[PDB]
Amino acid sequence: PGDFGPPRGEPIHAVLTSPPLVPPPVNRTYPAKVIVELEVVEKEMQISEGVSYTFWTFGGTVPGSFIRVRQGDTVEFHLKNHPSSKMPHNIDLHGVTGPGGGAASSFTAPGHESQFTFKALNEGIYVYHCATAPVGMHIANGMYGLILVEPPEGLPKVDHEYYVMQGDFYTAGKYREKGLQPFDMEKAIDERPSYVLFNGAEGALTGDKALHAKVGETVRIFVGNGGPNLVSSFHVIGAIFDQVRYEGGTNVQKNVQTTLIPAGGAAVVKFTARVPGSYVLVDHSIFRAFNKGAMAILKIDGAENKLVYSGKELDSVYL
Amino acid sequence: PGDFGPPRGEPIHAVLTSPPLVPPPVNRTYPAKVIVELEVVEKEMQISEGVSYTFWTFGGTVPGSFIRVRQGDTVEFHLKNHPSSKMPHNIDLHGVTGPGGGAASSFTAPGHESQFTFKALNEGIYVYHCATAPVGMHIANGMYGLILVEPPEGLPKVDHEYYVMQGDFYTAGKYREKGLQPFDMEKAIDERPSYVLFNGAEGALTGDKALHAKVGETVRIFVGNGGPNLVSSFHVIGAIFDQVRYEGGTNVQKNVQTTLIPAGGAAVVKFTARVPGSYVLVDHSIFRAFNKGAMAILKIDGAENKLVYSGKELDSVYLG
Amino acid sequence: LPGDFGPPRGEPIHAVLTSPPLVPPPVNRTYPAKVIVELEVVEKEMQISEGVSYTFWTFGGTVPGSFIRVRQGDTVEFHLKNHPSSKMPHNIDLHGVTGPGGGAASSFTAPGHESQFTFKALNEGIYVYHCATAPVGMHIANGMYGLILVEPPEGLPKVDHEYYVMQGDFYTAGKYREKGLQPFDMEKAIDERPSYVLFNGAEGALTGDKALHAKVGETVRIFVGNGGPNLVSSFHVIGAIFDQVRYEGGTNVQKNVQTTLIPAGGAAVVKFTARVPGSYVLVDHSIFRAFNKGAMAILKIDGAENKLVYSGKELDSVYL
């Protein structure tokens, strides 16, 4: 079970990436001791235009910092809780084998740092999240991210890797009602989200912050679903998934339009850019995408291929 | 990736089928140019007994006309919008590689026709739907269908193929409230459908409109889910799926009772009819099936096989 | 027909059914048998939560119902016994049955009656059974569901522990944890707004004294049903990773899965090895169900700490 022995070499200080970026491959044939530091920050951010929300974050972003390790690594986790935090936080990583996936070993009061160590026994793409009572509220405020545990051979090389995470959010106000929106427990219990978002905001991955790729380039997206409650009917408008690591497992389904991502679950999708234009990540529970903000953009630039996609060729009158 | 060369032979004028029928296998060894013509029609139809609804349709049905092509085919798509239409419409086919799955290239005003061409690069079974703002409304009014992209070698032969598509519907009125029912945007945004239906109506596939097969016949169902919002726990009462193309992909799960069909997704199920009687397609989120209309019938004709299924053999007094 | 091994051989087998969370032993058999299965329906008030009661409708006195274990190709002679204290008739649809209603049509049983019907278990798998008496949603919601395992001919790979767990959504007239005898609420059920989401028919059915157990080093197989009626489980074990999932209960496996979707009226099989001692939590990771509606069950692991795998908290320090 990832039995590649005791750690070797110098301890590696993991470099974490902010969404939507992914750390490079560990490019490593031996297990290492990997030191991971992650700081909780409670901060007001823009959930929608003119709409503020008090997010609780791992590394100041929703989703939180991406962590990349190799199956068989020993991970020395340091959870820091900023002095400015109103409350304690902890971490459950779905990649941990042990109680609370770390929750029991990571209670961190404001201004404190918890250290715990775990072996990454299983390859996969694992949701991590705060596991502080009430757990649903901590998740709903943005306390989730992904940790990639590579297989020992590493993943097949691609041109672009991206980090995207859906979440459902519960404001006291309705969708696009302006001002600082409190969290709404009643709506959260009833699974009636006001917003459904990729990367913590309407337009988090639109305009200048859109994902980018070129015609001919292979694209892998690690797609997390923090929930707390919703299951994503995950689709890219104008693309087909060549490969889906369905529910984030090792085995693949091929030629998929739309894949179900469980709440507190993940998937990996892979496809090749072939036509320039705007491609739209959506929850194909489609009112979420077009009426609650579940939309992110991948812009493809490069030469037109009119043999693959012509664009509109003729308009005519019809009786 | 569907690189079988330039289209060859005679240009094909696709014969589309109305649900629940499927066009025949393309039975071709070569990539072709396939001309597809599909007319949008807005029309009042019966959604339930004494209940009407203004459906928006590709080809006059919900779901829309079934399109069948081969991986590697160049599809020349003609979207016609009937002059009677109040709204413009377009089409996003999940089988299209490029912006909006064709939405960007298919804006069609009433009494207009849009032409756009694409290559079908990926085999699979793909939802198509209108992508006109508000997109959720156009889908909710029934603007969805399936396009089958065959592998180059074709699908394994079966006795029957059926076309079935779940949708969730949002009427101002409650379930079975009589009269012409408007669309309800509030129920749609809140994912609180008044009806969940196979093929656009309560009883669309019941009685004289049931699917049919005979004892001993292999059945393939292309099972679409137009949504807009619900995920189907898709089950056939009294059958087990020998094979499921889970999420409509190439690989297969075997021996599955109930398979989750994503909103804007599809599956293929295969089983063999062994025992005569009525088999019920349901959303096994079971209040949908028995209280909101999500039920369709497959009638199996032929000889009883009491060694597989006896029927009720005995009723006895029980004191317990 | 793979799964047809001809008619029963040897002496009839009187099946022993197990109450959750226990499973019958592997059958360990090389021939098709006539397996006589007897299952009694009992309607009874039970505690759904501390100081809250509910009138459950049960197969064999438990929610979920008694676990049935047979071999692919067995002839099952089913005896459904409805206790005369029952206020409703009941029947049974087993998702492992090939034929009308999965047996529902052959097992209509008035109070104080016994129905017999016979079927061949043609498909290996892990199948939901449930009552199919109108209103079907209500019979399921009152707890009439369980699992029947149809082993492959050679049996499943040996494990240290097999457990039986089944999620249900429940609809009370009152709110979550309001005390007293809670009526079924049909309006909440139709709206898919459960007051409780539970493992094995009650808050704490699988907590404290009733927790599951294994030892460090031991392989665990959990047969996870979802009776619904309406919800899909984002099924996770806090602190564990599924080495293998039989996704949607099918024969093929996915490897290294955190959270697997279990359809309404569906099932999965998860396998993992206990490596670290402590408390592991079965949840619906639609996580407000788990921590606000009671969708929480416990697996206690006992044995030697392994600090190389999980150290526990090593240091608390103060930082700016």
Ligand SMILES: O=N[O-]
């Ligand atoms: O087969 N069950 O609804």
Ligand SMILES: O=N[O-]
């Ligand atoms: O890891 N479960 O919330």
Ligand SMILES: [Cu+2]
């Ligand atoms: Cu927290």
Ligand SMILES: [Cu+2]
């Ligand atoms: Cu979790």
Ligand SMILES: [Cu+2]
């Ligand atoms: Cu339209």
Ligand SMILES: [Cu+2]
């Ligand atoms: Cu779509």
Ligand SMILES: [Cu+2]
């Ligand atoms: Cu019953």
